[PDB]
Ligand binder design. Structure first.
Ligand SMILES: */C(=C\C(=O)N1CCC[C@]1(C)C#Cc1cnccc1-c1[nH]c2c(c1Nc1cccc(Cl)c1OC)C(=O)NCC2)CN(C)C
Ligand SMILES: [Cl-]
Ligand SMILES: [Cl-]
Ligand SMILES: [Cl-]
Ligand SMILES: [Cl-]
Length: 308
């Protein structure tokens, strides 16, 4: 039962632009619900259409639940000059930016944990019949360095009870993250999300390299058909790279399931230095909420698509 809570414009203070791009415009603000002195840091999204963003709200409200650690939750919507979505501010931004900016303190334990968490979030969505269709490092957000959530439901589709696939029309889509069958046939499944997951893992393990850098999107299907894939990141031992390679198998049903990826990456996270080789790993640290001074980090922080 999908509900949308309408939040009054007057309940938001200190609204400031955070960034714009393919996803629209995102602002940060403080939400003060009437009848509370609680001030909640929020992110606020609008497109650049009203209908498009309501489709995203619908999907997000549909998949929310009491226990939902790794998928962004819609707090509500605001009707202003635009229709806006409201969510909890993720103060450390997106994981693509995070891994580029904190490379020198990202250890093996963080990378593997992020892999587990994304897989848990995707398994959660699969259980709710949701095909995300846009999983990428740019669309994973960082609540704390130890805790990430999947975002951007702009392309996501709910499968009917009898449906195993979504067939798309001619909209703009992220070719370099897509399964071969999605490029050729516009077919999307849970197993095509698994392909995108493998690309997402590659982005993390390269500390935010661009996939197939300097290769035109029009050439990707031919590269994949020839058996070529993204290269082995230097930190990755063979077992980690083989997971990625299994995610990029031609046969969709041969690819790992999210349930299996949770288990495998959890196993690796139990012995992280066995699976990723990072110079100075043991000497690295990132802010954690168990730190006395974590609040410092928070204040400091809080303060792709082509036509097929
Ligand atoms: C990713 C960086 C990035 O997203 N940044 C850099 C500074 C601002 C910005 C845009 C942000 C943010 C942010 C912060 N907190 C929560 C969410 C988001 C957000 N960012 C993106 C999406 C986000 N999700 C939002 C935002 C508001 C409201 C809702 Cl309901 C919601 O969930 C859908 C998103 O939807 N798509 C991607 C960006 C690297 N660049 C993306 C390249
Ligand atoms: Cl974890
Ligand atoms: Cl979107
Ligand atoms: Cl194959
Ligand atoms: Cl692309």
């Amino acid at each position: 039962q999908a509900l949308l809570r309408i939040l009054k414009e007057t309940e938001f203070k200190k609204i400031k632009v955070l960034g714009s791009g393919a996803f629209g415009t995102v602002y940060k603000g403080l939400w003060i619900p009437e009848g509370e002195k609680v001030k909640i840091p929020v992110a606020i999204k609008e497109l650049r259409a009203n209908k498009e963003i309501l489709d995203e709200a619908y999907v997000m409200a549909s998949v929310d639940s009491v226990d939902n650690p790794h998928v962004c939750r819609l707090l509500g919507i605001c009707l202003t000059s635009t229709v806006q979505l409201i969510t909890q501010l993720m103060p450390f931004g997106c994981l693509l930016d995070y891994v580029r900016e904190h490379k020198d303190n990202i250890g093996s334990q963080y990378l593997l944990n992020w892999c587990v968490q994304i897989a848990k979030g995707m398994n959660y969505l699969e259980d709710r019949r949701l095909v995300h269709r846009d999983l990428a490092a740019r669309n994973v957000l960082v609540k704390t360095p130890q805790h990430v959530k999947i975002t951007d439901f702009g392309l996501a589709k709910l499968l009917g009870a009898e449906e195993k696939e979504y067939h798309a029309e001619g909209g703009k889509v992220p070719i370099k993250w897509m399964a071969l069958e999605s490029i050729l046939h516009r077919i999307y499944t849970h197993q095509s999300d698994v392909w995108s997951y493998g690309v997402t893992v590659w982005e993390l393990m390269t500390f935010g390299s661009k996939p197939y850098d300097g290769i035109p999107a029009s050439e990707i299907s031919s590269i994949l058909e020839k058996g070529e894939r993204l290269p082995q990141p230097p930190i990755c031992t063979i077992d980690v790279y083989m997971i990625m390679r299994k995610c990029w198998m031609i046969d969709a049903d041969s690819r790992p399931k999210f349930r299996e990826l949770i288990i495998e990456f959890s196993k690796m996270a139990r012995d992280p230095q066995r699976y990723l080789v990072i110079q100075g790993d043991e000497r690295m640290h990132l802010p954690s909420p168990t730190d006395s001074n974590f609040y410092r980090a928070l204040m400091d922080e809080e303060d792709e698509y082509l036509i097929p």
